[PDB]
Amino acid sequence: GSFTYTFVVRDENSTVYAEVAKILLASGQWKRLKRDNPKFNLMLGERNRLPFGRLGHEPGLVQLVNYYRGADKLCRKASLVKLIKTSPELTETCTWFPESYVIYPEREEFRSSFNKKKENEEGNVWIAKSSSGGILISSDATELLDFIDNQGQVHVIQKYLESPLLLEPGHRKFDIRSWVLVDNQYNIYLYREGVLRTSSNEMFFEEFNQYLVTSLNINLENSILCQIKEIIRVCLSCLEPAISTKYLPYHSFQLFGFDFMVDKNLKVWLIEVNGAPACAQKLYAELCKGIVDLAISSVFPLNEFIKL
Ligand SMILES: [Mg+2]
Numbered sequence: 401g402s403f404t405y406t407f408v409v410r411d412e413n414s415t416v417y418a419e420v421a422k423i424l425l426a427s428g429q430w431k432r433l434k435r436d437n438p439k440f441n442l443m444l445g446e447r448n449r450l451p452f453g454r455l456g457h458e459p460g461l462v463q464l465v466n467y468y469r470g471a472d473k474l475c476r477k478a479s480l481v482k483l484i485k486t487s488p489e490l491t492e493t494c495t496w497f498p499e500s501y502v503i504y505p506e507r508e509e510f511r512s513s514f515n516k517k518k519e520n521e522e523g524n525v526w527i528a529k530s531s532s533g534g535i536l537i538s539s540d541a542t543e544l545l546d547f548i549d550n551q552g553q554v555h556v557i558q559k560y561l562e563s564p565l566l567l568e569p570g571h572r573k574f575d576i577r578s579w580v581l582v583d584n585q586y587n588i589y590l591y592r593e594g595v596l597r598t599s600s601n602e603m604f605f606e607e608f609n610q611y612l613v614t615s616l617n618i619n620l621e622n623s624i625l626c627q628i629k630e631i632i633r634v635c636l637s638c639l640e641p642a643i644s645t646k647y648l649p650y651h652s653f654q655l656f657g658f659d660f661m662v663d664k665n666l667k668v669w670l671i672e673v674n675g676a677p678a679c680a681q682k683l684y685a686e687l688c689k690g691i692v693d694l695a696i697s698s699v700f701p702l703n704e705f706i707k708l
């Protein structure tokens with residue numbers, strides 16, 4: 401063994417990949433080339449518009465890139481809503497996806513679903529946000545559509561979470577960020593350390609469990625984490641056929657940021673998936689060292705996480 405693999409960095413602003421790069425030059429087995437040098441083993445590409453087309457064309461060079469072409473399908477709200485509606489064993493089993501509708505500046509089922517709820521006298525407050533975009537949280541259909549026509553960005557209206565689980569003594573809402581790594585072979589690895597972002601400000605799984613227990617008859621693994629694993633798995637297993645690199649001339653892996661919400665019933669809902677998530681300062685090192693361990697050296701060996 402004992403080789404020297406190469407790599408280019410096309411995304412300077414990525415803290416997660418600037419960190420991976422420092423660990424790559426650390427191994428003393430990696431050499432960073434020039435931005436436009438075509439002879440790399442690894443490419444830590446740019447967030448948007450990455451030149452996938454020019455990969456794997458240098459004969460003899462096995463190439464790996466830190467992005468899965470077409471993964472924005474799962475990372476763009478509008479696309480995410482559509483990917484679920486179509487999907488057979490998903491749209492009818494998605495008890496974890498908020499009721500969503502895409503509107504360009506559809507809109508048909510929205511009303512037929514807004515009214516029903518009006519005539520059944522139940523929670524009927526929605527939220528308006530952009531797919532690649534700035535949000536509005538009203539309760540009147542027209543008080544939203546007419547607002548999505550002005551902005552002109554093709555948003556989606558989602559059933560807002562009215563009864564969210566809170567955190568005392570500050571009594572404040574939160575969301576959970578989960579890290580998932582998908583290697584070149586399509587193994588789904590979930591980083592054990594998650595993170596909670598609260599309002600009016602951050603709490604790791606550690607502190608979060610000494611709360612879901614010392615003030616409730618349940619554990620973090622038995623209530624939320626369990627559900628989180630199921631949603632991640634479903635979403636990625638559903639996306640695979642549209643992004644598999646099985647028959648492509650290069651390999652790819654990607655780190656995803658899954659963001660969730662929990663209501664009072666202790667139910668977990670998917671809020672969104674982030675294709676280029678940053679990290680929490682305390683985790684970078686352990687996280688990034690895991691990306692080189694599982695997604696990089698697993699392809700380019702050197703001298704010497706929960707798998708869903
Ligand atoms: Mg990158």
Ligand SMILES: [Mg+2]
Pocket residue numbers: 466467653654655656675
């Ligand atoms: Mg990635």
